[PDB]
């Protein structure tokens with residue numbers, strides 16, 4: 001697994017990517033790692049924001065599937081042509097797989113100027129694959145065709161400009177975290193869906209029906225930047241965060257994610273922004289654990305200037321990259337569970353720590369799920 005340590009790079013707010021090759025001879029591309037979708041897709045035609053793209057002409061192993069495809073994301077969309085080809089991950093397990101690939105021929109607000117990735121690796125399950133669930137996702141192909149175990153782990157690290165991390169394919173690398181792993185069930189195999197059973201801000205319970213926390217659903221999504229919260233929860237949370245930080249004032253466009261807020265270098269008043277604890281359903285009866293998030297996670301750095309990285313959703317909670325940052329996150333597909341621990345690259349505050357703590361007792365956790 002040491003071969004996979006530090007195999008991710010990215011720019012802040014523009015995702016994390018891993019190097020892969022496609023085709024014979026191998027064509028090299030940077031691919032964003034997305035646990036929030038299920039298609040493997042690459043630029044396959046010129047685009048202003050692509051430094052390179054997949055050239056199907058030049059691969060002896062390419063096979064056309066004679067079928068088109070499109071995927072609408074929350075941010076941007078693309079369309080293209082389905083095919084298969086041979087795929088490797090150079091800083092990955094030592095294997096070559098024949099996988100479905102969507103060649104992107106048109107797109108809208110998908111590729112990001114200067115991001116340095118040319119494609120996307122949807123690691124979630126077939127149920128949300130386009131055009132439908134008969135298009136086997138990449139990780140399913142990988143597992144079926146090799147002896148790679150059915151799990152991967154993600155260590156997303158913040159700054160320390162440019163970001164990095166590790167994607168361990170096939171297991172858990174114990175040098176990437178400290179303390180104990182805490183596991184929450186995958187509620188259903190489509191998104192990496194989970195259930196949040198309690199929320200506290202600076203130790204104060206939001207005191208909402210826990211169904212609200214999962215209104216629609218809650219997912220763990222490395223392809224989304226922000227922590228995204230259903231309307232009612234978002235409003236409760238911002239209220240509590242404003243009140244905690246009310247010795248300063250911010251344009252409420254800051255609270256909407258539109259405007260930066262800046263302080264003289266090294267003077268950011270971290271102490272006035274609360275910690276946020278999300279309690280997740282545990283593995284045994286009436287048992288949960290919490291992950292605690294620092295303001296250094298949800299004030300994304302862009303003097304020292306930041307964007308508010310908590311925003312509103314209408315498709316459920318999205319535990320995005322800024323939540324995953326500093327945690328070591330195990331996507332244990334084999335045992336239908338998501339593990340969290342404190343990362344080796346965890347986020348540092350001089351008087352506060354990000355934590356994964358348990359056990360907690362929580363009654364009636366099944367009521368927190370939404371139908």
Ligand SMILES: CCc1cn2c3c(cc(C(=O)N[C@@H](Cc4ccccc4)[C@H](O)[C@@H]4NCCN(Cc5ccccc5)C4=O)cc13)N(C)S(=O)(=O)C(C)(C)C2
Pocket residue numbers: 013014015032034035036037038071072073074075076110128129221223224225226228257311320
């Ligand atoms: C990193 C750029 C980025 C910046 N922001 C957002 C952003 C979101 C998403 C987002 O969308 N990510 C997609 C994949 C993707 C990744 C890179 C570029 C395009 C797309 C993911 O897959 C998502 N996972 C849940 C289900 N769905 C819908 C779906 C797809 C396929 C099958 C079923 C369902 C997603 O699209 C990306 C960004 N923000 C809104 S936000 O964080 O708050 C923001 C601060 C306003 C800005």
